[PDB]
Amino acid sequence: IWNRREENLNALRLGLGYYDSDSEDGEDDVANIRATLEAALDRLMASAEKGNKLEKKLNLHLGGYKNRAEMLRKKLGEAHAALEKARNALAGFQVL
Amino acid sequence: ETDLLPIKTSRVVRPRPPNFTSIPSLLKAFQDEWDALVLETYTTREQL
Amino acid sequence: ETDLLPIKTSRVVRPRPPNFTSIPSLLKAFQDEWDALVLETYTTREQL
Amino acid sequence: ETDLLPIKTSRVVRPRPPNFTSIPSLLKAFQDEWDALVLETYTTREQL
Amino acid sequence: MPAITTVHESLPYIDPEPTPEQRAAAEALIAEERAKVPDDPYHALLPPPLPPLNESRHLTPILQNELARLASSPDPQAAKMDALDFSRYEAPEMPSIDSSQSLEETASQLWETLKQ
Prior knowledge:
The structure is cut from a larger assembly and holds one copy of chain A (96 residues), three copies of chain B (48 residues) and one copy of chain E (116 residues).
Chain A: H1 2-8, H2 11-15, H3 26-95
Chain B: H1 23-47
Chain E: H1 20-36, H2 61-72, H3 103-115
């Protein structure tokens, strides 16, 4: 019965609590969908503002750690390149 | 360790579609699948 | 009668066909592509 | 099967960046990493 | 590893360093020798050639297509792949439903906006 309800009615329509079985009018369903969309937009805006504030705080906390990690990675890459060059030079020096 | 037993069988070959022969098309397909899964999870939460 | 155990099926989730659009299949394909690219890059690096 | 010894130790956990905390950001980072890997492979082949 | 077995009578820690004029004369002599003796592409000192995209077993067809696309770009270092749909993750604005719009079309647009 639940599968038939979710197949006949849409999954998004069944998720919305304003989609009643006796509400066959498109205008009432459109108004309910518009109200739900406005509420979802307000909730998403509030969540986006909170996430932006949290991300700004986290970036201000961890920017130094990120910069230190980037500098260490660059130094490690330069050291690996120098190690490869030194290994080649050592092999050539042994042959010579 | 005891009640769960593995099954030793041949691997089922998934037919790769011809659209999934490039990095951008496969990335778009994966993004669409992830968006569909996220929408399905949100709809399941709202329905619950 | 004793060593053979039957397999039961649960219909809690919808039946997903084993296509190329599955999230786990896409992850496995991406991992295989990364492994092949890594092997090619390792061979090229050894030659270089 | 015989000469390969697995290593039993803990798993290294990468530090999650504050910017890499969203699915679209993760997808963009994955696309950038794949493009960088392809460019590195092409440059390695040309250098070889 | 090196494979050169040629022996040259040089002791640079004991012998004097060649002059820039002497180095130029030696370079001219080597150039004259290379002009006299043509280069051999099938020399044993040269390494084996790199296999092509089709010859490589590790190179996938998707990888070959991506490599061809990168090579076709005039700046392969600056070549970038196409970005995903970032507008789908953007903030969904309120849809403007006109009075001439159908009820079913407006309902479908509202449902799509609600899903986004």
